[PDB]
């Protein structure tokens, strides 16, 4: 009972990547696996738990919460199709939303509890995972390396999968701001909220707050640069800015908070770099996420971190110490659950199966649950324009007929296909509007199969759908030649 | 009379496609005949085809409206609060808004004719007079006033389909989907008759807009609705229509209908069951619209089924006469008809002979909740392949544990030739299914194997990613015979 335990693989982080690897090594290959996490259930104080950032304070609750936010649009848009009810009685109870999310998230926590009790050679250890040596993980009561040892775990192989954490800027009064972590637990919806960042978390939470805000509430999103959502298609960036604007979100571009102080009433006084001021009840920082490397004591074994602070890996998830691997947000690349999952599965097939495999980081389909949402896979046209001599862009944009009736004329569906015009290969596909995230998944499979634009236009539409726009573009709307935009070819 | 390269009888999905490509792509002279310039009684179809006027478009809009019965109830779960007892569904408003949407489309097709060189719209009833002449008359009666005689080097038959009405006493007291679109009042009790997608769709529509104590019944003559769709999906959407308060009578078929003193209809079934309803909507089938064409004047061969016979290039037995869309009784979908029109016109005026592929067409049923499907159901596939595998995923979505629509099970199924892992068919029931399936259509045109699905990186969180997370077959067919494990 006072003895070290010995394992084929120790995984630090029972999240998206770590649980895929752990489960696969144990049930596909009969390896003996230990999995360390700091908490068995979602919430304060450590927020991520068993199941990772995605289950506890990420993809899962944010989706249930955006689902809730969509009803403000449904209730309003119902009028146009003939629905009548007292508009004046309509109230949004945040406490019911939060309590329902809390139950859904705890159920997944509990299902995970049972997986670990039941499955041979897959064990759960509660605490903070640190590297003592090439073959020993120590599990401490806290992230403080001086805290009590609960366990020592011998591992032939060690998987680093501790994920990421919110980045807080060093500004005066930062202690009066929150991250996405605390947002999930606010006991009441803020009347006034600044969400700081042009990234998918700022935009997603702005929509949530915008819908659950009490009477006379206001949601402000601020971003240091000119146009939110860097990395996504410029048409889609511009349009989702109009659509957030049209739903009563104030977008402050080229603005950045310099300091936060309390007003005498407990509210927050934000001073921007520009000298502008805003009073809010909540300042949610969402300016980025950083690899959680601190607490691992990587120094003890000399695991190399990148310039940026991520664990350096090759294509096979291998650090500079052989037998020590890193996957998911700790590698500080694409910060997505299914990428974490694919990397973990590829790592286990390589180390423990004998089917070596490297995750493909290109043509990865992803979504933004803005209202309305983004669906995207592959290159945006300006990235394409720098790698291929001739890029074609197929664009279709329209107001869905249903929104001529709903009264939401402002909800432009946008569908964009980017091709290598030399040979028709689809490089990239971008969608804005309802069902964009469900449309784009299958588009992922197409691109992995090197679909050309003719493979798309030769497929017969399903009518009536938004999706059918993708099988209806025969003529490029414009081109890039040698990196330069033009309606026509010379 | 006037001179044309192409006369198109019918200005619908396939006819307008064919007409538009002939004029704007090949510089041909084109006459198109339809019987009405905009939607609704007396002829229901018009400029646009059945889809635009009394089919895909209005029905989608009206299903969109019916969905708000689920949205309003399901919002409680996410903490939305309002006086439920003040909730009322105004059908008149829905119809008026549908009507405006359809009229603006009819007007934009007028627009297109006025502005398109070599493309002419003629109002009236087309029929063949001889091999090279289309007559347009005042009405369907082949002895009404000639309006136009059109000399044509090529003639395209594109008159579409009509609701099949069975030969039973009191069939006059029944409506079709055409009249459903124009009901002045939402029926309190209604009987949709038929297991196909039109009966199911309308059942959903009426269920939402029904006045206070109303009731939607759907009856089908055989034991399970929606023949031709995956059997699991067929069983599940049955469960889910019942759950939302729609009575499904299986193995029941109307024997007659009579008038009640209050203007309601008394339906007697073959079993001798009886049901009093405000409306009986017949949706047992659709048949090629071939009567008014006078096909005998030239001897265009019909199939036993009633549809105009064509080869794979939509050519009839008469040299310069072609048929596309519903009139050929192949797949009765708009994009299939558009794809035949385009294909015919390239063949005849483009010397690039193209045939339309009728395999692995994606289709949708706009049930609540909706179906999305492409390619073979496992039963058809078991008759064509030694080793078929079926991968199955079925769950209540987390959002329906919260809304309280616990009954809304999502179903994803992939059918494969297990010999090589080739994806034969994909079948979805759940929110987004019709959106999910479109690109699956592109996938089946790229010889996607099951492993191509499960090696694609998921988009999380979605229903769609369930397609890319199935690696172990649930069960198999070996020489036609369902079994859980392989014999080895
Ligand atoms: C608000 C938000 C929304 C998101 N939405 C989406 C989305 O919709 N779709 C999507 O694809 N991605 C989304 N993401 C990103 C997604 O959550 C991550 O990419 C994914 O969770 C990363 O998985 P991972 O395996 O790298 O680590 P994680 O899932 O983060 O798991 C790491 C685990 O390690 C634990 N841990 C850390 N240090 C230690 C230690 N020393 N010892 C023990 N345990 C430790 C943590 O408690 C955590 O449980 C979202 C992220 C956030 C913050
Ligand atoms: C209620 C309903 C819902 C449907 N929903 C969908 C759906 O969601 N998706 C889908 O893909 N398909 C759907 N369909 C099927 C779709 O409507 C048809 O497959 C499609 O419209 C067929 O086009 P077509 O060119 O064959 O004929 P049509 O589109 O019907 O065009 C035929 C035209 O010919 C005209 N005409 C007829 N006789 C004459 C004559 N003698 N002279 C001149 N003109 C004449 C008619 O007025 C009509 O406008 C639906 C059908 C119905 C009935
Ligand atoms: O809503 C929605 N969605 C979603 C789904 C749905 C639905 C419907 C409903 F109820 C619900 C839902 C929406 C809106 C709008 C949309 C679309 N867009 C448009 O419109 N487009 C334009 C262009 N195209 C092309 C094709 C070809 C052709 C040609 C000619 C002939 C015919 C055809 C058309 C056109 C063109 C040309 C001309 Cl001239 C014409 Cl007139 C037309 C396509 C595309 O969508
Ligand atoms: O709803 C819905 N949907 C839709 C979308 C969404 C969502 C969520 C939310 F809130 C909203 C919306 C539903 C429910 C149920 C179902 C199904 N089933 C299951 O199970 N799955 C899960 C999983 N996957 C992938 C992978 C997984 C795994 C891994 C490893 C090992 C184990 C497992 C995804 C996910 C999910 C969930 C979770 Cl929690 C996770 Cl973490 C993940 C598949 C699927 O779905």
Residue numbers in the entry:
A (entry chain B): -1 to 488
B (entry chain A): 2 to 488, 493
Quote the passages of the study that discuss this structure, keeping the authors' original sentences.
Trypanothione reductase (TR) is a suitable target for drug discovery approaches against leishmaniasis, although the identification of potent inhibitors is still challenging. TR structure from different protozoan parasites has been extensively characterized by crystallography, showing that all key residues are conserved. This homodimeric flavoenzyme possesses four cavities binding two nicotinamide adenine dinucleotide phosphate hydrogen (NADPH) and two trypanothione molecules. The active site features a hydrophobic cleft, named mepacrine binding site (MBS) after the crystal structure with the mepacrine inhibitor was solved.
To validate the predicted binding mode for further rational structure-based drug design and ligand optimization, the structures of TbTR with the most promising compounds 9, 10, and 14 were determined by X-ray crystallography. Additionally, with an eye to ligand efficiency, the p-fluorophenyl group in B of 5, 8, and 10 was removed while keeping in A the diClBn or the phenylpropane, leading to 12, 13, and 14, respectively. Quaternization of the piperazine promotes improvement in IC50 values compared to that of 5 (IC50 = 54.6 μM) by about 3-fold for 9 (IC50 = 20.5 μM), 42-fold for 10 (IC50 = 1.31 μM), and 23-fold for 14 (IC50 = 2.35 μM). The densities observed inside the trypanothione pocket for both TR dimers provided well-defined results for some portions of the compounds, namely, the ethyl-p-fluorophenyl and furan moieties, indicating that these common portions anchor 9, 10, and 14 to the Z-site by van der Waals and electrostatic interactions, as previously observed for fragment. From the interaction network, it is clear that the furan and the ethyl-p-fluorophenyl groups anchor 9, 10, and 14 to the Z-site, consistently with the binding of the initial fragments. Despite the presence of the bulkier side chains of M406 and Y106 in hGR (replacing the smaller L399 and A102 in TbTR), it seems that the binding of 10 and 14 toward hGR is not fully hampered.
